């Protein structure tokens, strides 16, 4: 049996809220670069359309809600997320102090069309803020990413 309430849908929507400006159920191949441009790394025009082909639901570059995360959910353990534990630390760390604040984080995601501000989101850091610096430490990565 499978059940998804407002708790499992918000974490499933949290990923769709970035690649979709209004959340119509389908995202453009151009939004990926909008998230990658936020990740700091973003590929060329055709190199980004190749990311939707990994699942090829419509083979047009557009993808639905249950179709994008499916081929991407099996690719988390189909590689090595340990080498990745340091990457999210290398990406998020703007000043390289060991803690990344949410104040800059959502202003960062805001270039996509967020309904949340870089400031008001900081109420969220409290979920991964184990060091209490109002930012995320190196200790929260292994807890949230390794222990899902």
């Amino acid at each position: 049996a499978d059940q998804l309430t407002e708790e499992q849908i918000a974490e499933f929507k949290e990923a769709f809220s970035l690649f979709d400006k209004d959340g119509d159920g389908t995202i453009t191949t151009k939004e990926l670069g909008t998230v990658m441009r936020s990740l700091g790394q973003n590929p060329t025009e055709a190199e980004l359309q190749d990311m939707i082909n990994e699942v090829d639901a419509d083979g047009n570059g557009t993808i639905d809600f249950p179709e994008f995360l499916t081929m991407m959910a099996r690719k988390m353990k189909d590689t090595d997320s340990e080498e990745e534990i340091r990457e999210a630390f290398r990406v998020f760390d703007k000043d390289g102090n060991g803690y990344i604040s949410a104040a800059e984080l959502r202003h960062v995601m805001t270039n996509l069309g967020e309904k949340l501000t870089d400031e008001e989101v900081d109420e969220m850091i409290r979920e991964a803020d184990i060091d209490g610096d109002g930012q995320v430490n190196y200790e929260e990565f292994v807890q949230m990413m390794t222990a899902k």
Binding site: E14, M36, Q41, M76, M124, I125, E127
Partner: peptide, 17 residues
């Protein structure tokens, strides 16, 4: 993945492609 854990993991999946 719940609120800020999923937003962090989404960054991990967008780079492993």
């Amino acid at each position: 993945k719940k609120t800020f854990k999923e937003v962090a993991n989404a960054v991990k999946i967008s780079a492993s492609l």
